[PDB]
DNA sequence: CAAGTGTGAGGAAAAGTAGTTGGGTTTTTTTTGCAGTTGAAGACA
């Protein structure tokens, strides 16, 4: 039950939390060592950097259900391990991601952290429409300045194989 | 043929809050024994 800046801070925090839970199932499923884990961290460390700057009372951040996978997608692309469609289908099919419902957290309490123009909107609101999927991957790249930072973006001779 | 600024709204969701009701205490301001006695109507010198 918190409104305003600090409501945002833990909405921030919770967002922080689930992405991390997302990443570790990431490792278990793909077993792609420290590497997958740490690149993902700093990626959001980088994402956080900008959020603090336009703070004051900037509440444009609260990321969408999609921002998290865009983040993991961007980081993977760095690592260039896989593909998007395959990743998305696999994730939905096995609920590999905690993406769908936001009750996990470790919140019990973050849940009650009331919603404050936030936390309630997190975890499992809806399924992606059209580009919409990327309509934010691009934004994240925008926030990130990702292309300069990370090598070989979107590539994969593996998507071609997957496709044939 | 084609690419590019400016921008209004549509939509979602948990909890609150509405309407309609009821419950709910609350809260509350037929003589059966006795003995005596008074007053009565009636009566009298």
Curated annotation (Swiss-Prot):
Recite the UniProt keywords alphabetically: DNA-binding, Metal-binding, Nucleus, Transcription, Transcription regulation, Zinc, Zinc-finger
Entry's localization field:
Nucleus, Nucleolus
The intrachain disulfides are none
**One CC-aspect GO term:** nucleus
N-terminal cyclin fold: annotated span = 9-117
Instruction: Provide the GO biological process annotations.
Output: nucleolar large rRNA transcription by RNA polymerase I
* Lineage: superkingdom: Eukaryota
Molecular function terms, GO-annotated? RNA polymerase I core promoter sequence-specific DNA binding; TBP-class protein binding; zinc ion binding
Similarity annotation: Belongs to the RRN7/TAF1B family.
Q: What is known of its domains?
A: Although it shares weak sequence similarity with SUA7/TFIIB, displays a similar subdomain organization as SUA7/TFIIB, with a N-terminal zinc finger, a connecting region (composed of B-reader and B-linker regions), followed by 2 cyclin folds.
**Assembly and binders:** Component of the core factor (CF) complex, which consists of RRN6, RRN7 and RRN11. The CF heterotrimer may further dimerize to form a hexamer. RRN7 interacts with RRN6, RRN11, SPT15 and RRN9.
What this chain does, per the entry, is described as: Component of RNA polymerase I core factor complex (CF) that acts as a SUA7/TFIIB-like factor and plays a key role in multiple steps during transcription initiation such as pre-initiation complex (PIC) assembly and postpolymerase recruitment events in polymerase I (Pol I) transcription. Binds rDNA promoters and plays a role in Pol I recruitment. After binding of UAF (upstream activation factor) to an upstream element of the promoter, CF is recruited in a SPT15/TBP-dependent manner to form a pre-initiation complex.
Miscellaneous note of the record: Present with 398 molecules/cell in log phase SD medium.
What this protein is called in its record is RNA polymerase I-specific transcription initiation factor RRN7
In terms of the parent sequence, the fragment covers 94 to 257 of 514
């Amino acid at each position: 039950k918190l409104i305003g800046h600090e409501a945002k801070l833990l909405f921030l925090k919770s967002f922080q939390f689930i992405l991390k839970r997302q990443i570790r199932w990431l490792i278990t499923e793909m077993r792609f060592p420290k590497e997958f884990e740490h690149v993902a961290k700093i990626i959001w460390l980088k994402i956080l950097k900008t959020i603090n700057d336009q703070p004051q009372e900037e509440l444009k951040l609260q990321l969408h259900m999609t921002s998290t996978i865009s983040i993991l997608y961007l980081a993977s692309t760095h690592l260039s391990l896989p593909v998007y469609t395959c990743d998305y289908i696999k994730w939905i099919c096995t609920a590999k991601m905690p993406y769908f419902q936001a009750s996990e957290i470790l919140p019990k309490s973050w849940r009650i952290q009331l919603p404050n123009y936030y936390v309630s909107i997190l975890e499992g609101s809806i399924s992606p429409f059209n580009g919409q999927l990327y309509n934010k991957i691009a934004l994240t790249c925008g926030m990130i300045h990702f292309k300069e930072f990370f090598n070989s973006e979107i590539s994969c001779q593996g998507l071609l194989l997957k496709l044939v």
